[PDB]
Amino acid sequence: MTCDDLKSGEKRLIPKPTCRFKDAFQQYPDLLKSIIRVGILKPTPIQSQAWPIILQGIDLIVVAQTGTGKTLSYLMPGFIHLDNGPGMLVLTPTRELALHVEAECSKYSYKGLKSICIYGQIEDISKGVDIIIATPGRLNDLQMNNSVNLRSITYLVIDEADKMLDMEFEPQIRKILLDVRPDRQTVMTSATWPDTVRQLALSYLKDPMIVYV
Numbered sequence: 001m002t003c004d005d006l007k008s009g010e011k012r013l014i015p016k017p018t019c020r021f022k023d024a025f026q027q028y029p030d031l032l033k034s035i036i037r038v039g040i041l042k043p044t045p046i047q048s049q050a051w052p053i054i055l056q057g058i059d060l061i062v063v064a065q066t067g068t069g070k071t072l073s074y075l076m077p078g079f080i081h082l083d084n085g086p087g088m089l090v091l092t093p094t095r096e097l098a099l100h101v102e103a104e105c106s107k108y109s110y111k112g113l114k115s116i117c118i119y120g121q122i123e124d125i126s127k128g129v130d131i132i133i134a135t136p137g138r139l140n141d142l143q144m145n146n147s148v149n150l151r152s153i154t155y156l157v158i159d160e161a162d163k164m165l166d167m168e169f170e171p172q173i174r175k176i177l178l179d180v181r182p183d184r185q186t187v188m189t190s191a192t193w194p195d196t197v198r199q200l201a202l203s204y205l206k207d208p209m210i211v212y213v
């Protein structure tokens with residue numbers, strides 16, 4: 001596992017890993033209690049590095065395949081960022097992944113946080129929602145149809161961006177991010193880091209760091 005500052009100009013110190021939940025989230029007893037109740041033992045390597053970076057308000061690229069704990073890498077700090085529609089948006093390439101993310105979300109949710117999983121409905125989004133987990137296709141069609149307000153989103157995750165590219169979802173994603181506000185925090189995940197994904201990434205992130213398993 002490597003970590004770097006990809007900002008132009010002066011490089012910033014890399015926050016120290018937080019190898020215990022307590023070290024990342026001691027400030028947030030309700031999130032800790034939620035973790036304790038689930039009964040997992042320790043942060044995964046990428047969690048231990050991703051968390052302190054996101055908590056400092058720095059945009060992050062995580063390059064990592066499934067099984068490494070990448071979901072909680074971006075979900076936990078998103079919960080903290082939340083405490084006017086949803087404030088958090090997670091874009092996933094497929095229904096299966098959206099469902100996977102939504103399942104982790106509701107397993108670890110506390111302080112009456114509400115999430116919705118949206119894929120290929122409007123009524124639940126018309127009531128209060130804090131977190132949207134969505135495929136780009138269905139979410140784009142919803143904004144066009146005036147069904148969803150994205151203007152309160154300040155925490156955005158783009159999950160599996162290489163898959164997003166293979167699937168040619170760039171036009172839909174670009175259009176969704178337009179309704180999202182520019183002063184936002186952004187995390188991006190990807191299983192790979194070729195030049196096309198690097199270019200895409202920088203079209204989403206400002207002054208980002210990277211964690212690369």
Ligand SMILES: Nc1ncnc2c1ncn2[C@@H]1O[C@H](COP(=O)(O)O)[C@@H](O)[C@H]1O
Nearest residue numbers: 040042043044066067068069070071072
């Ligand atoms: N710190 C952890 N300890 C044990 N399991 C975890 C941890 N973090 C995430 N997981 C689980 O590992 C699986 C793979 O997660 P991901 O790589 O995010 O798809 C998911 O089912 C998670 O709920």
Ligand SMILES: [Cl-]
Nearest residue numbers: 001002003004
């Ligand atoms: Cl390193």
